Write a protein that binds this DNA or RNA. Structure first.
Ligand SMILES: [Mg+2]
Ligand SMILES: [Mg+2]
Ligand SMILES: [Mg+2]
Ligand SMILES: [Mg+2]
Ligand SMILES: [Mg+2]
Ligand SMILES: [Mg+2]
Ligand SMILES: [Mg+2]
Ligand SMILES: [Mg+2]
Ligand SMILES: [Mg+2]
Ligand SMILES: [Mg+2]
Ligand SMILES: [Mg+2]
Ligand SMILES: [Mg+2]
Ligand SMILES: [Mg+2]
Ligand SMILES: [Mg+2]
Ligand SMILES: [Mg+2]
Ligand SMILES: [Mg+2]
Ligand SMILES: [Mg+2]
Ligand SMILES: [Mg+2]
Ligand SMILES: [Mg+2]
Ligand SMILES: [Mg+2]
Ligand SMILES: [Mg+2]
Ligand SMILES: [Mg+2]
Ligand SMILES: [Mg+2]
Ligand SMILES: [Mg+2]
Ligand SMILES: [Mg+2]
Ligand SMILES: [Mg+2]
Ligand SMILES: [Mg+2]
Ligand SMILES: [Mg+2]
Ligand SMILES: [Mg+2]
Ligand SMILES: [Mg+2]
Ligand SMILES: [Mg+2]
Ligand SMILES: [Mg+2]
Ligand SMILES: [Mg+2]
Ligand SMILES: [Mg+2]
Ligand SMILES: [Mg+2]
Ligand SMILES: [Mg+2]
Ligand SMILES: [Mg+2]
Ligand SMILES: [Mg+2]
Ligand SMILES: [Mg+2]
Ligand SMILES: [Mg+2]
Ligand SMILES: [Mg+2]
Ligand SMILES: [Mg+2]
Ligand SMILES: [Mg+2]
Ligand SMILES: [Mg+2]
Ligand SMILES: [Mg+2]
Ligand SMILES: [Mg+2]
Ligand SMILES: [Mg+2]
Ligand SMILES: [Mg+2]
Ligand SMILES: [Mg+2]
Ligand SMILES: [Mg+2]
Ligand SMILES: [Mg+2]
Ligand SMILES: [Mg+2]
Ligand SMILES: [Mg+2]
Ligand SMILES: [Mg+2]
Ligand SMILES: [Mg+2]
Ligand SMILES: [Mg+2]
Ligand SMILES: [Mg+2]
Ligand SMILES: [Mg+2]
Ligand SMILES: [Mg+2]
Ligand SMILES: [Mg+2]
Ligand SMILES: [Mg+2]
Ligand SMILES: [Mg+2]
Ligand SMILES: [Mg+2]
Ligand SMILES: [Mg+2]
Ligand SMILES: [Mg+2]
Ligand SMILES: [Mg+2]
Ligand SMILES: [Mg+2]
Ligand SMILES: [Mg+2]
Ligand SMILES: [Mg+2]
Ligand SMILES: [Mg+2]
Ligand SMILES: [Mg+2]
Ligand SMILES: [Mg+2]
Ligand SMILES: [Mg+2]
Ligand SMILES: [Mg+2]
Ligand SMILES: [Mg+2]
Ligand SMILES: [Mg+2]
Ligand SMILES: [Mg+2]
Ligand SMILES: [Mg+2]
Ligand SMILES: [Mg+2]
Ligand SMILES: [Mg+2]
Ligand SMILES: [Mg+2]
Ligand SMILES: [Mg+2]
Ligand SMILES: [Mg+2]
Ligand SMILES: [Mg+2]
Ligand SMILES: [Mg+2]
Ligand SMILES: [Mg+2]
Ligand SMILES: [Mg+2]
Ligand SMILES: [Mg+2]
Ligand SMILES: [Mg+2]
Ligand SMILES: [Mg+2]
Ligand SMILES: [Mg+2]
Ligand SMILES: [Mg+2]
Ligand SMILES: [Mg+2]
Ligand SMILES: [Mg+2]
Ligand SMILES: [Mg+2]
Ligand SMILES: [Mg+2]
Ligand SMILES: [Mg+2]
Ligand SMILES: [Mg+2]
Ligand SMILES: [Mg+2]
Ligand SMILES: [Mg+2]
Ligand SMILES: [Mg+2]
Ligand SMILES: [Mg+2]
Ligand SMILES: [Mg+2]
Ligand SMILES: [Mg+2]
Ligand SMILES: [Mg+2]
Ligand SMILES: [Mg+2]
Ligand SMILES: [Mg+2]
Ligand SMILES: [Mg+2]
Ligand SMILES: [Mg+2]
Ligand SMILES: [Mg+2]
Ligand SMILES: [Mg+2]
Ligand SMILES: [Mg+2]
Ligand SMILES: [Mg+2]
Ligand SMILES: [Mg+2]
Ligand SMILES: [Mg+2]
Ligand SMILES: [Mg+2]
Ligand SMILES: [Mg+2]
Ligand SMILES: [Mg+2]
Ligand SMILES: [Mg+2]
Ligand SMILES: [Mg+2]
Ligand SMILES: [Mg+2]
Ligand SMILES: [Mg+2]
Ligand SMILES: [Mg+2]
Ligand SMILES: [Mg+2]
Ligand SMILES: [Mg+2]
Ligand SMILES: [Mg+2]
Ligand SMILES: [Mg+2]
Ligand SMILES: [Mg+2]
Ligand SMILES: [Mg+2]
Ligand SMILES: [Mg+2]
Ligand SMILES: [Mg+2]
Ligand SMILES: [Mg+2]
Ligand SMILES: [Mg+2]
Ligand SMILES: [Mg+2]
Ligand SMILES: [Mg+2]
Ligand SMILES: [Mg+2]
Ligand SMILES: [Mg+2]
Ligand SMILES: [Mg+2]
Ligand SMILES: [Mg+2]
Ligand SMILES: [Mg+2]
Ligand SMILES: [Mg+2]
Ligand SMILES: [Mg+2]
Ligand SMILES: [Mg+2]
Ligand SMILES: [Mg+2]
Ligand SMILES: [Mg+2]
Ligand SMILES: [Mg+2]
Ligand SMILES: [Mg+2]
Ligand SMILES: [Mg+2]
Ligand SMILES: [Mg+2]
Ligand SMILES: [Mg+2]
Ligand SMILES: [Mg+2]
Lengths: 74, 53, 59, 92
RNA sequence: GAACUGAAACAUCUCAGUACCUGAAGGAGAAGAAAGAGAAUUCGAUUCCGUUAGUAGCGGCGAGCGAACCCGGAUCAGCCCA
RNA sequence: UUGAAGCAUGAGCCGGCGACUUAGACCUGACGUGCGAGCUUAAGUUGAAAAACGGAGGCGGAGCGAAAGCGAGUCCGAAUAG
RNA sequence: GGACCGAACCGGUGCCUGCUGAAACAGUCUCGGAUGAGUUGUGUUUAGGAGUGAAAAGCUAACCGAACCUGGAGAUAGCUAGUUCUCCCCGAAAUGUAUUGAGGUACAGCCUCGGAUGUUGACCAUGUCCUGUAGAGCACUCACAAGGCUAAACCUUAUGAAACUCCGAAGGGGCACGCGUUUAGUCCGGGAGUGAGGCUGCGAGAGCUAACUUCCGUAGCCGAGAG
RNA sequence: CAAGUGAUCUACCGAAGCUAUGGAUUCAACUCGCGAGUUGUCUGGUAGGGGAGCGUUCAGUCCGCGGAGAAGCCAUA
RNA sequence: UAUAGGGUGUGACGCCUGCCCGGUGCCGGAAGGUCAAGUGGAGCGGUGCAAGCUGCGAAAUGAAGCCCCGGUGAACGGCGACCGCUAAGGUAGCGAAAUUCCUUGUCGGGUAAGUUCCGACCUGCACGAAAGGCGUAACGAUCUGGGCGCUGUCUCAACGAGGGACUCGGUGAAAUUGAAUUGGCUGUAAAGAUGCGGCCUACCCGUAGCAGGACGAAAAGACCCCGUGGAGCUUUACUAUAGUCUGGCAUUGGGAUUCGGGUUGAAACUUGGAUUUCUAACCUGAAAAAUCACUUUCGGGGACCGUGCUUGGCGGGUAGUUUGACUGGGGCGGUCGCCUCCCAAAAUGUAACGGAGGCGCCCAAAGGUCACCUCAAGACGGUUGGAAAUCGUCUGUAGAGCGCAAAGGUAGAAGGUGGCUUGACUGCGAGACUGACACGUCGAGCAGGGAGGAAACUCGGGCUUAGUGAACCGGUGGUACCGUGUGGAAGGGCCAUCGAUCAACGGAUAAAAGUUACCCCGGGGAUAACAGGCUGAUCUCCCCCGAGAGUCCAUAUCGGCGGGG
RNA sequence: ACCCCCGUGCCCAUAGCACUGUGGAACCACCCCACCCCAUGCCGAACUGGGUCGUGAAACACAGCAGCGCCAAUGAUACUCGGACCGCAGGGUCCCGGAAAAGUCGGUCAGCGCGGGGGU
């Protein structure tokens, strides 16, 4: 049939290496796809956001071991 | 949000008087036992009166 | 115009145009979130070029 | 289709009752002589259209004496009028 | 006492008291001597121009319609009857 | 017009006629000029082989609010967050 | 005698001729009625949502599903045409979104002019993150070839997959750097137009793995490009 | 009897591409007067934007012309 | 002056005219239901110190009308959407008929041969009784079939005549016309070429002729679609309305009777209603005076009617209008918003009348927190209980569950169970995701207050992703800003909320359906029908393999299942 | 310092399972009883609480072991950015770098800390 609906825009907003601010969105994905690490929060929609300004970094080995974290600069 | 003759309802809150409102959606599905809950008005805080009508 | 008079589209010092917030307004609200008491003053100047000549005597 | 204007809420008011001619405080004090503008300076002074009451508001400041007759003024201005010496008077 | 038209359709609304018709009259006519305007216990017959002012307001509060008071001018006369 | 020598439109030929205007104390930009903490008059009056006069009014000069109002502050609110 | 035949007269059945006519409805031949609901002269009456009509929406001054004239009136026209003197500089669009919207409008995108800013643009290289197509492969779900076993399971052997995935590139995307070449970019403000695209190669759907088909993606050209 | 065809090599042909010589626009720079001048650069083009101009009538002003002849008309290298 | 007049349908005459009123209309309908203005006016509120002045305002009472009951079909109508139940289901007569789809129905007649015509039959796609049924002498420039007669209609044309056509003298038009120095074939081009390419042919110019081409001329296609273009018509579309019915109030008065009752058991100033009656208003007719006017003398009607104002109904008789888009032309059908997967080409984004499926909710606990708990399935053994139960042990990266649709996700749980609970909070909102806008999504942290925990802490609904409606206009609770001399109040504003299958889901007005073959305009080859063009599913034809038939033998002929052109 | 035990991290199967052997007054564990703290929607099995003997059986701990799991090359190939092409079409090729999945060769039954108790 002809009934499919809407874009939904899920993604990884700030990729590893990037300098986040406080309140920026790091990932948009569906349930758990990335786990919130050090310095990273998570909302209703999941969707990790930045707790503290700094540099974003990706950490994984396998499975659900994916993690997003922040660290400061100075 | 739409409304009809059917089950559940929209029900307002009590007098935190203050003459005040809350209005959470409710249901007659479980029971007609009415209701009372805790909320805060202009006056004070947590003045807890009964679901109306 | 007479339309934006008691309505939104307020001009400011910089000449920028002030918009209110719509959803929801006096009906069909229900639900939960703050957001009810969260419809305030707002704006964008992209459309606003066309809103100046609609009512400028006042701000 | 349906213009933004119509889509946008308001009721609000109109009114617009009494509105005051502003007299900038920097204008009196410091520059010129701080010459005691009195009640009607008018010409050589900044009020023009009038037929509207005049209010005196604090903007610039220095210590010099002044006597200002206006319809009203800000209390934080009227603070600096006496604290430099001088006064602000209002009608009965 | 119209309609096309406009409101991007159409009924309120707009066109517009316009067009047309009829009646009366003059070189002009109409209007006029406050049971008024108004909010200063102010003005001071009428008409006209500028301005107030796209301001107050009117409106499927839509399209769109839209004053007057103060002030500045042209001209300025009030006289008679129950 | 995606695409025209087109068997798609128009035109027999030559002359002459023939289509982005005008209006407003309107709005908003650019260039130019004169005055610039200010700038400028309208209707009208006077004088016209020519122009002066006329401050009624208009525009800067304070913003914020739904409004009362307050004022380099204002608004939402008990504050501070905005 | 709303009888018969048949002239006058009234009428138009059939064929033809005529078609820039002799004629804006006729001519020859033929035919109908030819004392009746007959033919026709004069004067008169009825008209525009009105008249008349043995009834076709017929007639109402050679074009009547609403006559003519004058006026509102330069009605309105999201439609069709047309828009004239020269050289120079730049230079598009036929996409998105919404629309009583689909050949029309609004906003954004793309063009230009001016001011501000000033290498922030561009390519390419390094570094780092993100991805589930190509291929592959049955470990999940559906499918499925030959057996073994005591019909599902189970074992040997063997396959398919847009809506399967144990895996998984080439490329692509973001950020940093300029380790090195280039020259644009952004903001503010004036003016726009375009919003019907077409073809080919590659990647798909629909189609019949048909179309100078249709609908998206992607590069290049015509579009607006002569040699 | 290849002017068919597979492979290899090399001479020439061939565009408004590149090159030669000359010339003009565009922007940019360098100072000269307080427009010009070499250098480097640019210049296909529809809707559309920007810029500089040609010609017609009228008007003000200036300079003038015309019966030994005005405008208009006709011819031309 | 009902042997009359109006309307309607039928249509000499003859034999006749059935069944069904449920719905619609129409005529007649004392109970009862609803119902307008208007009489009545309990009570609620505003202002003033008050007299009082004022804003709404219901019981009862109030007409015609519909609802409800009965009847009425030479009233609208109905008498096969497989019998389907709906008031009933076809009386005569007719039927392959002007009705018949299949259809050239099947027989028969006529012809050498008959899709027609005639006669039968009947299985009437969709005969039938005043839209009349079936007959009927006569009539017909009516329509259909057949015969005789005669014939140029024909085989098949010939000769002859007159009038044009042609030639000379005279006068002398027209539509049309980018410009032309205007060939054939075969290609190519916007897809039918004199004008492009290659090849061929062709001395210059005329007159009489012919109609293939010049997509020949004529008329900005009348078919088709398009335009938020038009006009005629229609109705149970919308809306008003001429018209008409009805209540109240005037014109418009009197008296008897009765009931309802007030002011001073009757008297009685009376105030109205109902029937009745009178007569001055008013209408109206005869008399020498035709329309009138009158003293009128009169005769009848008469508070009615008519008429002015207002109340409610009826009202295609009339009038203004509405009647969406998408769409491999339009229509019919389907589809419009929202969530999930595939398409989607390993970023996001991405279309088709592409391939599948769901949403317009639920949950007072399926929420908050605090604690503990671990599933599906198999094998063995076990009790009305066996496929499946309940119990036991063993295996048991999930093969389970998560309220619904799928994807992601989940074992240190979001899943299973309890304790206590109201954060499914008021005031804000750093900084980001996403959108042309308008929307939409996430969110640390601050304060006022809480909740669970001993505590770190967590909480401003749910594993997330669907469960929605801008603005306008308005209902309710607050709040006390505005408030037209002032002080109040009516009215308005901000706070919170309720109203929307406005589902054509960015929503046109508060309120809207059809038809045009009588059609008109503005356009479109942006878009159907004819033809061409590209294509070749289908259609036509050929080929390949060879099982089988041909007693025997595939291949004299015929060629299963398949295959290629 | 060494042996080892108890705790607790990092790593986040090349550290996992089964077959199995050592371990016991020092540490862990079972065992012991529990009206009450506390607690099983039935059972103190689980939490919980009072403590020995016993036991090293179970659970745990370490050593063994490469049958299973898990990791897994080099070679070649699939595919592919870019370049250049053949076929009416389905499809195919050449150059250029990039370069999998599976499979084989193999590699393993881990590594790295902090603290405390106990032997030498
Ligand atoms: Mg999607
Ligand atoms: Mg790992
Ligand atoms: Mg303001
Ligand atoms: Mg109209
Ligand atoms: Mg209109
Ligand atoms: Mg009107
Ligand atoms: Mg007149
Ligand atoms: Mg006269
Ligand atoms: Mg005036
Ligand atoms: Mg005056
Ligand atoms: Mg006077
Ligand atoms: Mg075309
Ligand atoms: Mg061409
Ligand atoms: Mg042509
Ligand atoms: Mg055309
Ligand atoms: Mg022509
Ligand atoms: Mg104007
Ligand atoms: Mg002005
Ligand atoms: Mg004016
Ligand atoms: Mg200027
Ligand atoms: Mg100056
Ligand atoms: Mg006769
Ligand atoms: Mg006879
Ligand atoms: Mg006739
Ligand atoms: Mg005749
Ligand atoms: Mg006869
Ligand atoms: Mg009519
Ligand atoms: Mg005539
Ligand atoms: Mg005529
Ligand atoms: Mg007409
Ligand atoms: Mg016109
Ligand atoms: Mg007009
Ligand atoms: Mg129109
Ligand atoms: Mg117009
Ligand atoms: Mg260029
Ligand atoms: Mg949308
Ligand atoms: Mg635009
Ligand atoms: Mg620029
Ligand atoms: Mg400037
Ligand atoms: Mg640089
Ligand atoms: Mg940049
Ligand atoms: Mg850069
Ligand atoms: Mg796949
Ligand atoms: Mg594959
Ligand atoms: Mg997949
Ligand atoms: Mg493997
Ligand atoms: Mg990679
Ligand atoms: Mg602009
Ligand atoms: Mg311009
Ligand atoms: Mg514009
Ligand atoms: Mg469009
Ligand atoms: Mg388009
Ligand atoms: Mg396209
Ligand atoms: Mg297909
Ligand atoms: Mg095509
Ligand atoms: Mg074009
Ligand atoms: Mg070319
Ligand atoms: Mg180009
Ligand atoms: Mg070329
Ligand atoms: Mg060149
Ligand atoms: Mg040169
Ligand atoms: Mg150019
Ligand atoms: Mg001369
Ligand atoms: Mg001249
Ligand atoms: Mg009849
Ligand atoms: Mg009955
Ligand atoms: Mg037959
Ligand atoms: Mg037939
Ligand atoms: Mg026979
Ligand atoms: Mg015959
Ligand atoms: Mg027969
Ligand atoms: Mg025949
Ligand atoms: Mg026939
Ligand atoms: Mg028959
Ligand atoms: Mg009958
Ligand atoms: Mg009948
Ligand atoms: Mg019938
Ligand atoms: Mg009949
Ligand atoms: Mg009959
Ligand atoms: Mg006859
Ligand atoms: Mg005939
Ligand atoms: Mg015959
Ligand atoms: Mg015979
Ligand atoms: Mg002859
Ligand atoms: Mg002859
Ligand atoms: Mg002659
Ligand atoms: Mg001649
Ligand atoms: Mg020739
Ligand atoms: Mg060709
Ligand atoms: Mg051609
Ligand atoms: Mg040809
Ligand atoms: Mg040729
Ligand atoms: Mg040529
Ligand atoms: Mg001819
Ligand atoms: Mg046309
Ligand atoms: Mg016609
Ligand atoms: Mg219409
Ligand atoms: Mg009426
Ligand atoms: Mg009425
Ligand atoms: Mg009508
Ligand atoms: Mg009606
Ligand atoms: Mg359509
Ligand atoms: Mg169709
Ligand atoms: Mg259409
Ligand atoms: Mg469907
Ligand atoms: Mg994607
Ligand atoms: Mg991609
Ligand atoms: Mg697209
Ligand atoms: Mg789609
Ligand atoms: Mg598909
Ligand atoms: Mg849980
Ligand atoms: Mg506690
Ligand atoms: Mg918080
Ligand atoms: Mg209220
Ligand atoms: Mg007042
Ligand atoms: Mg109030
Ligand atoms: Mg919409
Ligand atoms: Mg809409
Ligand atoms: Mg509406
Ligand atoms: Mg509607
Ligand atoms: Mg007909
Ligand atoms: Mg007609
Ligand atoms: Mg037409
Ligand atoms: Mg076409
Ligand atoms: Mg189209
Ligand atoms: Mg179209
Ligand atoms: Mg045809
Ligand atoms: Mg045709
Ligand atoms: Mg065709
Ligand atoms: Mg082809
Ligand atoms: Mg055989
Ligand atoms: Mg054989
Ligand atoms: Mg053979
Ligand atoms: Mg065959
Ligand atoms: Mg074949
Ligand atoms: Mg341990
Ligand atoms: Mg020992
Ligand atoms: Mg025990
Ligand atoms: Mg063991
Ligand atoms: Mg290798
Ligand atoms: Mg290969
Ligand atoms: Mg390639
Ligand atoms: Mg090729
Ligand atoms: Mg290949
Ligand atoms: Mg390469
Ligand atoms: Mg390679
Ligand atoms: Mg490699
Ligand atoms: Mg491998
Ligand atoms: Mg091996
Ligand atoms: Mg071991
Ligand atoms: Mg240690």
């Amino acid at each position: 049939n002809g009934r499919d609906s809407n874009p939904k825009y899920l993604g990884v907003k700030k990729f590893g290496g990037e300098v986040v601010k406080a309140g920026n969105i790091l990932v948009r994905q569906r349930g758990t796809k990335f786990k919130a690490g050090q310095g990273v929060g998570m909302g209703r929609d999941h969707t990790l956001f930045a707790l503290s300004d700094g540099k974003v970094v990706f950490i994984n080995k396998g499975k659900g071991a994916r993690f997003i974290s922040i660290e400061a600069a100075q | 949000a739409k409304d009809g003759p059917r089950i559940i309802v929209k029900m307002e809150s009590s007098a935190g008087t203050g003459f005040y409102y809350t209005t959470t959606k409710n249901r007659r599905n479980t029971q007609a036992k009415l209701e009372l809950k805790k909320y805060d008005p202009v006056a004070k805080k947590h003045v807890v009166f009964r679901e109306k009508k | 115009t007479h339309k934006m008079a008691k309505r939104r589209i307020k001009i400011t010092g910089t000449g920028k145009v002030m918009a209110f917030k719509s959803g929801k307004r006096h009906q069909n609200t229900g639900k939960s979130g703050d957001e009810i008491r969260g419809k305030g003053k707002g704006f964008v100047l992209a459309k606003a070029e066309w809103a100046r000549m609609k009512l400028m005597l006042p701000r | 289709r349906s213009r933004l204007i119509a889509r946008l809420p308001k009721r609000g008011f109109n009114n617009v009752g009494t509105t005051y001619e502003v007299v900038k405080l920097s204008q009196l004090q410091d520059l010129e002589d701080t010459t005691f503008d009195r009640d009607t300076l008018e010409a050589y002074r900044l009020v023009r259209r009038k037929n509207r009451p005049v209010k005196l508001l604090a903007s610039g400041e220095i210590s010099r004496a002044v006597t200002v007759h206006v319809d009203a003024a800000s209390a934080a201005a009227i603070k600096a009028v006496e604290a430099a010496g001088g006064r602000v008077v209002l009608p009965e």
